[PDB]
Amino acid sequence: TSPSYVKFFTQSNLEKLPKYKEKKAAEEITCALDYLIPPPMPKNQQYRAFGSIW
């Protein structure tokens, strides 16, 4: 199956997103709209790819 987060991706939340993004400019999840915003990059660069697999 797909990640649980899909459930938040409704056209309603999508519409409210632009405004939410501004207010915020004024793990840390506090509401559903936070899931429509990509997670932050970890500090450990072990998350950087060692190579490519085709």
């Binding site: 797909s2 990640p3 899909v6 991706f9 997670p39 932050p40 990059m41 950087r48 085709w54």
Partner: protein
């Protein structure tokens, strides 16, 4: 023994976007009935294009997934959805 904590959202989305690198799996998805009723899944896959850019893209080990993701997305816009969930343009295939 082998055990570690459950994954993060970052960790989960990275694991997920990358499995789209395998065509059999991507196929299993487009031939789901439920996921195409609601724009949820379609909207989610467009959100995931955040990996297509740095610093995210530097984390991808399976590069085919980013191309397939982009195609899959463009397909969706023009894609005509049946009334059940069946994606119209694919009904014919095996």
């Amino acid at each position: 023994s082998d055990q570690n904590p459950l994954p993060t959202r970052f960790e989960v989305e990275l694991e997920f976007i990358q499995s789209l690198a395998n065509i059999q799996y991507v196929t299993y998805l487009l031939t789901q009935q439920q996921i195409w009723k609601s724009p949820n899944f379609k909207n989610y896959l467009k959100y995931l294009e955040y990996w297509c850019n740095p610093p995210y893209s530097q984390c991808i080990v399976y590069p085919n997934c980013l191309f397939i993701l982009k195609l899959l997305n463009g397909f969706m816009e023009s894609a005509i959805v049946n009334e059940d969930g069946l994606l119209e343009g694919l009904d014919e295939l095996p």
